[PDB]
Coordinates of C-alpha atoms and ligand atoms in Angstrom, one line a residue:
Chain A
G1 CA -0.4 -37.6 -7.8
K2 CA 1.6 -36.3 -4.8
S3 CA 3.5 -33.4 -6.6
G4 CA 0.2 -32.0 -8.0
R5 CA -1.5 -32.3 -4.6
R6 CA 1.5 -30.4 -3.0
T7 CA 1.1 -27.6 -5.4
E8 CA -2.7 -27.5 -4.8
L9 CA -2.2 -27.3 -1.0
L10 CA 0.4 -24.5 -1.4
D11 CA -2.0 -22.5 -3.6
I12 CA -4.8 -22.9 -1.0
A13 CA -2.4 -21.7 1.7
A14 CA -1.4 -18.7 -0.5
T15 CA -5.0 -17.7 -0.9
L16 CA -5.7 -17.8 2.8
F17 CA -2.5 -15.9 3.6
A18 CA -3.5 -13.2 1.1
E19 CA -7.0 -12.9 2.5
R20 CA -6.5 -13.3 6.3
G21 CA -2.8 -12.4 6.7
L22 CA 0.1 -14.5 7.7
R23 CA -0.1 -14.2 11.5
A24 CA -3.9 -14.9 11.6
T25 CA -3.9 -18.1 9.4
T26 CA -3.1 -21.5 11.0
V27 CA -2.2 -24.8 9.6
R28 CA -5.6 -26.0 10.7
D29 CA -7.2 -23.2 8.7
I30 CA -5.3 -24.4 5.6
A31 CA -6.1 -28.1 6.2
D32 CA -9.8 -27.2 6.7
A33 CA -9.8 -25.3 3.4
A34 CA -8.2 -28.4 1.8
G35 CA -10.7 -30.9 3.3
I36 CA -8.0 -32.6 5.4
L37 CA -6.5 -32.7 8.8
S38 CA -3.2 -30.9 9.7
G39 CA -1.3 -34.1 9.8
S40 CA -1.8 -34.6 6.1
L41 CA -0.5 -31.1 5.5
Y42 CA 2.7 -32.0 7.5
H43 CA 3.3 -35.0 5.3
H44 CA 3.9 -32.5 2.4
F45 CA 5.4 -29.5 4.2
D46 CA 7.8 -29.0 7.1
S47 CA 6.0 -26.0 8.5
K48 CA 3.7 -23.0 7.8
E49 CA 6.9 -21.0 7.5
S50 CA 8.3 -23.2 4.8
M51 CA 5.0 -22.8 2.8
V52 CA 5.3 -19.0 3.0
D53 CA 8.9 -19.1 2.0
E54 CA 8.1 -21.3 -1.1
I55 CA 5.3 -19.0 -2.1
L56 CA 7.4 -15.9 -1.8
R57 CA 10.4 -17.4 -3.6
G58 CA 8.4 -18.8 -6.5
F59 CA 7.1 -15.3 -7.2
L60 CA 10.2 -13.3 -6.4
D61 CA 12.7 -15.4 -8.2
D62 CA 10.7 -15.1 -11.4
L63 CA 10.0 -11.4 -10.9
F64 CA 13.6 -10.4 -10.1
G65 CA 14.9 -12.6 -12.9
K66 CA 12.8 -10.5 -15.3
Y67 CA 13.7 -7.2 -13.7
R68 CA 17.4 -8.1 -14.0
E69 CA 17.2 -9.1 -17.6
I70 CA 15.1 -6.0 -18.5
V71 CA 17.7 -3.7 -17.1
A72 CA 20.5 -5.6 -19.0
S73 CA 18.5 -5.9 -22.3
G74 CA 19.6 -2.7 -24.0
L75 CA 16.2 -0.9 -23.9
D76 CA 16.3 2.9 -23.8
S77 CA 15.5 4.5 -20.4
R78 CA 11.8 5.2 -20.8
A79 CA 11.2 1.7 -22.4
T80 CA 13.2 0.1 -19.6
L81 CA 11.0 1.8 -17.0
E82 CA 7.9 0.8 -19.0
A83 CA 9.0 -2.8 -19.1
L84 CA 9.7 -3.0 -15.4
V85 CA 6.3 -1.6 -14.5
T86 CA 4.5 -3.8 -17.0
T87 CA 6.3 -6.8 -15.4
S88 CA 5.1 -5.9 -12.0
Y89 CA 1.5 -5.6 -13.2
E90 CA 1.8 -8.9 -15.0
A91 CA 2.7 -10.5 -11.6
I92 CA -0.4 -8.9 -10.0
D93 CA -2.4 -10.9 -12.6
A94 CA -0.3 -14.2 -12.6
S95 CA 0.7 -14.4 -8.9
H96 CA -2.1 -12.4 -7.2
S97 CA -2.0 -14.1 -3.8
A98 CA 1.8 -14.0 -3.6
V99 CA 1.8 -10.2 -4.5
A100 CA -0.8 -9.6 -1.8
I101 CA 1.4 -11.3 0.8
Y102 CA 4.4 -9.4 -0.4
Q103 CA 2.7 -6.1 -0.4
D104 CA 0.6 -6.3 2.8
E105 CA 1.7 -9.3 4.8
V106 CA 5.5 -9.4 5.3
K107 CA 6.3 -6.4 7.4
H108 CA 6.9 -8.7 10.3
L109 CA 9.0 -11.3 8.4
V110 CA 12.0 -9.0 8.6
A111 CA 12.6 -10.1 12.2
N112 CA 13.0 -13.8 11.0
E113 CA 16.4 -15.0 9.9
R114 CA 14.8 -17.2 7.3
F115 CA 13.5 -14.2 5.4
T116 CA 16.7 -12.0 5.3
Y117 CA 16.4 -12.3 1.5
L118 CA 13.4 -10.0 1.6
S119 CA 15.6 -7.1 2.8
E120 CA 18.3 -8.0 0.2
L121 CA 15.6 -7.8 -2.5
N122 CA 14.5 -4.4 -1.2
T123 CA 18.0 -3.1 -1.5
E124 CA 18.3 -4.7 -5.0
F125 CA 14.9 -3.4 -6.2
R126 CA 16.1 0.2 -5.2
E127 CA 19.4 -0.4 -7.0
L128 CA 17.7 -1.6 -10.2
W129 CA 14.8 0.9 -10.4
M130 CA 16.6 3.9 -9.0
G131 CA 19.5 3.1 -11.3
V132 CA 17.1 3.3 -14.3
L133 CA 15.8 6.6 -13.0
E134 CA 19.3 8.0 -12.6
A135 CA 20.3 6.9 -16.2
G136 CA 17.2 8.4 -17.6
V137 CA 17.8 11.7 -15.9
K138 CA 21.4 11.8 -17.2
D139 CA 20.3 10.9 -20.8
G140 CA 17.5 13.4 -20.9
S141 CA 14.6 11.0 -20.9
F142 CA 13.3 12.0 -17.5
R143 CA 13.0 15.5 -15.9
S144 CA 16.0 16.9 -14.1
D145 CA 13.8 18.8 -11.6
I146 CA 12.4 15.8 -9.8
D147 CA 14.4 14.2 -6.9
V148 CA 15.3 10.7 -8.0
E149 CA 14.9 9.2 -4.5
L150 CA 11.4 10.6 -4.2
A151 CA 10.5 9.4 -7.7
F152 CA 11.9 6.0 -6.8
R153 CA 9.9 5.8 -3.5
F154 CA 6.8 6.8 -5.5
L155 CA 7.4 3.9 -7.9
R156 CA 8.3 1.5 -5.1
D157 CA 5.3 2.3 -3.0
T158 CA 2.8 2.2 -5.8
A159 CA 4.1 -1.0 -7.5
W160 CA 1.7 -3.5 -5.9
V161 CA -1.2 -1.4 -4.5
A162 CA -3.6 -2.4 -7.3
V163 CA -3.5 -5.9 -5.8
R164 CA -6.1 -4.7 -3.3
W165 CA -8.8 -4.3 -6.0
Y166 CA -7.5 -6.0 -9.2
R167 CA -9.2 -9.2 -10.2
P168 CA -7.4 -11.7 -12.4
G169 CA -9.7 -13.0 -15.2
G170 CA -11.8 -9.8 -15.2
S171 CA -12.7 -7.8 -18.4
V172 CA -10.1 -5.1 -17.3
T173 CA -6.7 -6.5 -18.5
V174 CA -3.8 -5.9 -16.3
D175 CA -2.2 -4.5 -19.5
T176 CA -4.8 -1.8 -19.8
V177 CA -4.1 -1.0 -16.2
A178 CA -0.3 -0.9 -16.7
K179 CA -0.6 1.3 -19.8
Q180 CA -2.7 3.8 -18.0
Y181 CA -0.6 3.9 -14.9
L182 CA 2.5 4.5 -17.1
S183 CA 0.7 7.2 -19.2
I184 CA -0.1 9.1 -16.0
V185 CA 3.3 8.7 -14.3
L186 CA 5.3 9.5 -17.4
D187 CA 3.2 12.0 -19.3
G188 CA 0.9 13.3 -16.6
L189 CA -2.9 13.5 -15.9
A190 CA -3.1 17.2 -16.9
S191 CA -4.0 18.1 -20.5
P192 CA -0.8 19.1 -22.5
Chain B
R1 CA -2.5 12.7 30.1
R2 CA -5.4 10.9 28.3
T3 CA -4.1 12.4 25.0
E4 CA -0.5 11.2 25.7
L5 CA -1.8 7.7 26.4
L6 CA -3.9 7.6 23.2
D7 CA -0.8 8.7 21.2
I8 CA 1.3 6.0 22.8
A9 CA -1.4 3.4 21.9
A10 CA -1.6 4.7 18.3
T11 CA 2.2 4.3 17.9
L12 CA 2.0 0.7 19.1
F13 CA -1.0 -0.1 16.9
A14 CA 0.9 1.3 13.9
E15 CA 4.2 -0.5 14.8
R16 CA 3.0 -3.9 16.1
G17 CA -0.5 -4.0 14.6
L18 CA -3.8 -4.0 16.4
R19 CA -4.1 -7.7 17.2
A20 CA -0.5 -8.0 18.3
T21 CA -1.1 -5.2 20.8
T22 CA -2.7 -5.8 24.3
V23 CA -3.8 -3.4 27.0
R24 CA -0.7 -4.5 29.1
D25 CA 1.5 -3.6 26.1
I26 CA 0.0 -0.1 25.9
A27 CA 0.3 0.2 29.7
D28 CA 3.9 -0.9 29.8
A29 CA 4.9 1.5 27.0
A30 CA 3.2 4.3 28.9
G31 CA 5.0 3.3 32.1
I32 CA 1.7 3.0 33.9
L33 CA -0.4 0.1 35.3
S34 CA -3.2 -1.4 33.2
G35 CA -5.7 -0.2 35.8
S36 CA -4.7 3.4 35.0
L37 CA -5.5 2.8 31.3
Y38 CA -9.1 1.6 32.1
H39 CA -9.6 4.9 34.0
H40 CA -9.3 6.7 30.7
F41 CA -10.6 4.2 28.1
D42 CA -12.9 1.3 28.4
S43 CA -11.2 -0.9 25.7
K44 CA -8.5 -1.2 23.1
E45 CA -11.3 -1.1 20.5
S46 CA -12.6 2.3 21.8
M47 CA -9.1 3.6 21.6
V48 CA -8.8 2.6 17.9
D49 CA -12.2 4.1 17.3
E50 CA -11.2 7.5 18.8
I51 CA -7.8 7.5 16.9
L52 CA -9.5 6.9 13.6
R53 CA -12.3 9.3 14.1
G54 CA -10.0 12.2 15.2
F55 CA -8.0 11.8 12.0
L56 CA -10.8 11.2 9.6
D57 CA -13.2 13.8 10.9
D58 CA -10.5 16.5 10.5
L59 CA -9.4 15.1 7.1
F60 CA -12.9 14.9 5.5
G61 CA -13.8 18.3 6.9
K62 CA -10.9 19.7 5.0
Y63 CA -11.7 17.8 1.8
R64 CA -15.3 19.0 1.9
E65 CA -14.1 22.6 2.4
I66 CA -11.7 22.3 -0.5
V67 CA -14.2 20.9 -2.9
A68 CA -16.6 23.7 -1.9
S69 CA -13.9 26.5 -2.1
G70 CA -14.2 27.4 -5.8
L71 CA -10.7 26.6 -6.9
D72 CA -10.1 25.5 -10.5
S73 CA -9.9 21.7 -11.2
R74 CA -6.2 21.3 -11.0
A75 CA -5.8 23.5 -8.0
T76 CA -8.6 21.6 -6.2
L77 CA -6.9 18.2 -6.9
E78 CA -3.5 19.7 -5.7
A79 CA -5.2 20.9 -2.5
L80 CA -6.9 17.6 -1.8
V81 CA -3.6 15.7 -2.2
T82 CA -1.6 18.2 -0.2
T83 CA -4.2 17.8 2.6
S84 CA -3.7 14.0 2.6
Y85 CA 0.1 14.4 2.8
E86 CA -0.2 17.0 5.7
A87 CA -2.3 14.3 7.6
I88 CA 0.6 11.8 7.1
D89 CA 2.9 14.3 8.8
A90 CA 0.4 15.4 11.6
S91 CA -1.2 12.0 12.3
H92 CA 1.3 9.5 11.1
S93 CA 0.2 6.7 13.3
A94 CA -3.5 7.2 12.6
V95 CA -2.8 7.1 8.9
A96 CA -0.7 3.9 9.2
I97 CA -3.6 2.3 11.2
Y98 CA -6.1 3.4 8.6
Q99 CA -4.0 2.4 5.5
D100 CA -2.4 -0.9 6.8
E101 CA -4.0 -2.1 10.0
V102 CA -7.8 -2.3 9.8
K103 CA -8.6 -4.8 6.9
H104 CA -10.2 -7.0 9.6
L105 CA -12.4 -4.1 10.9
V106 CA -14.0 -3.1 7.6
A107 CA -16.8 -5.7 7.9
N108 CA -17.2 -4.9 11.7
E109 CA -20.5 -3.1 12.7
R110 CA -19.1 -0.3 14.9
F111 CA -16.7 0.7 12.1
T112 CA -19.4 1.1 9.4
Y113 CA -18.1 4.7 9.0
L114 CA -15.0 3.3 7.1
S115 CA -17.3 2.2 4.2
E116 CA -19.3 5.4 4.3
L117 CA -16.0 7.3 4.0
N118 CA -15.0 5.3 0.9
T119 CA -18.2 6.4 -0.7
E120 CA -17.7 10.0 0.4
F121 CA -14.0 10.0 -0.7
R122 CA -15.2 8.9 -4.2
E123 CA -18.0 11.5 -4.3
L124 CA -15.5 14.2 -3.5
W125 CA -12.5 13.1 -5.5
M126 CA -14.2 11.5 -8.5
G127 CA -16.3 14.7 -8.7
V128 CA -13.2 16.7 -9.1
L129 CA -11.7 14.4 -11.7
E130 CA -14.8 14.3 -13.8
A131 CA -15.2 18.1 -13.6
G132 CA -11.5 18.5 -14.7
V133 CA -11.9 16.2 -17.7
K134 CA -15.0 18.1 -18.7
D135 CA -13.4 21.5 -18.4
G136 CA -10.2 20.4 -20.2
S137 CA -7.9 20.5 -17.2
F138 CA -7.3 16.7 -17.2
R139 CA -6.8 14.5 -20.2
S140 CA -9.9 13.2 -22.0
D141 CA -8.1 10.0 -23.3
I142 CA -7.6 8.5 -19.8
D143 CA -10.0 6.0 -18.2
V144 CA -11.4 8.1 -15.4
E145 CA -12.3 5.0 -13.3
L146 CA -8.7 3.7 -13.3
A147 CA -7.5 7.3 -12.7
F148 CA -9.6 7.5 -9.6
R149 CA -8.4 4.1 -8.4
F150 CA -4.9 5.4 -8.9
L151 CA -5.5 8.5 -6.8
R152 CA -7.3 6.4 -4.0
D153 CA -4.7 3.6 -4.1
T154 CA -1.8 6.0 -3.7
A155 CA -3.1 8.6 -1.2
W156 CA -1.5 7.1 1.9
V157 CA 1.3 4.8 0.7
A158 CA 4.1 7.2 1.7
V159 CA 3.1 6.5 5.3
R160 CA 5.3 3.5 5.4
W161 CA 8.5 5.6 5.1
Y162 CA 7.6 9.2 5.7
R163 CA 8.3 10.5 9.2
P164 CA 8.2 14.0 10.7
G165 CA 11.6 15.7 10.8
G166 CA 13.0 14.0 7.7
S167 CA 15.4 15.9 5.4
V168 CA 12.5 17.5 3.5
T169 CA 9.1 18.5 4.6
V170 CA 5.9 16.7 3.6
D171 CA 5.1 19.7 1.5
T172 CA 8.1 19.0 -0.7
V173 CA 7.0 15.4 -1.0
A174 CA 3.5 16.4 -1.9
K175 CA 4.7 18.9 -4.5
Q176 CA 7.0 16.4 -6.2
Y177 CA 4.4 13.7 -6.2
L178 CA 1.8 16.1 -7.7
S179 CA 4.3 17.2 -10.3
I180 CA 4.8 13.6 -11.4
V181 CA 1.1 12.7 -11.4
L182 CA -0.1 15.9 -13.1
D183 CA 2.9 16.7 -15.5
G184 CA 4.7 13.4 -15.8
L185 CA 8.2 12.2 -15.0
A186 CA 9.2 12.2 -18.8
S187 CA 11.1 15.3 -20.1
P188 CA 9.0 17.6 -22.4
Ligands
LIG201 MG1 -9.5 -8.8 -1.3

């Protein structure tokens, strides 16, 4: 009973945070959406803050666990990059609200002690992905005339942007979207 | 003076966000009294409006000229993208406000122009994509709708890190990003 309700309340909060933003969503907004009063919410959660933290960690622990294993898995450089990107798109489908909060809603969490892990993960994401780029330039998979930091920043800044329009459960599979993004970024939009 | 103040406001909007910025915040940052602000502008909202319009009017004027200019399909796309990047360098705060700070204004009446500009951006950019697929410039095996979404999704994202006076110019950034998008990151 209680554990399932907790999960439901947390998902309602995630959806409101993704739509309205973190700073503009109150515990009363969450409670209203759940058909309860704020007191009932506090029986399950310490704070709005703790809800955000749990939503972000659920998503990021899983995501970074996959990134880390992909890079350690022995795939060649192009396949490694393809797997990393595909994993990101799969999260847009599976964890849509969390991705939206991560992409558009957490600029201002950097100021908060409790969310220092976000900056650590930014450092780590660069290490992982830019490392793959470096290895693929060295091994001939990727072009040697593109700056690796610029290429990294392009990948980083375009990882989550589809969350603004992508609808989970639509006829357009997140897989179709990943494959096309990868075909453009790796092989180019121009006719060969 | 009115221009200096508007720029200071734009920086605050981009750095704090619109709703976290008050008139007194803008006044304080400008080292002036709030009363002096109201001499130039009637509201925080009117300031946002003028910042966005200045940027978007110039931008879409250039997009319209480029599409009308008779370049080949790839060169037209290259020019449109390069124009977007030049706006990130020239109007950094305005781009940040447009890209990241106005989700709550899209449904607002006085900012109806945002939606009209989505439509126009599509007319102009999707027109170029479709023409380039037709003339053999761009691949026929790609989903043109998803390709457009990718060009639109990614136009402004470098605003979060790019600043004037960095170690390379925005022209270098534009050229490298065009090279990836058009020719691919993989080796031949
Ligand atoms: Mg939405």
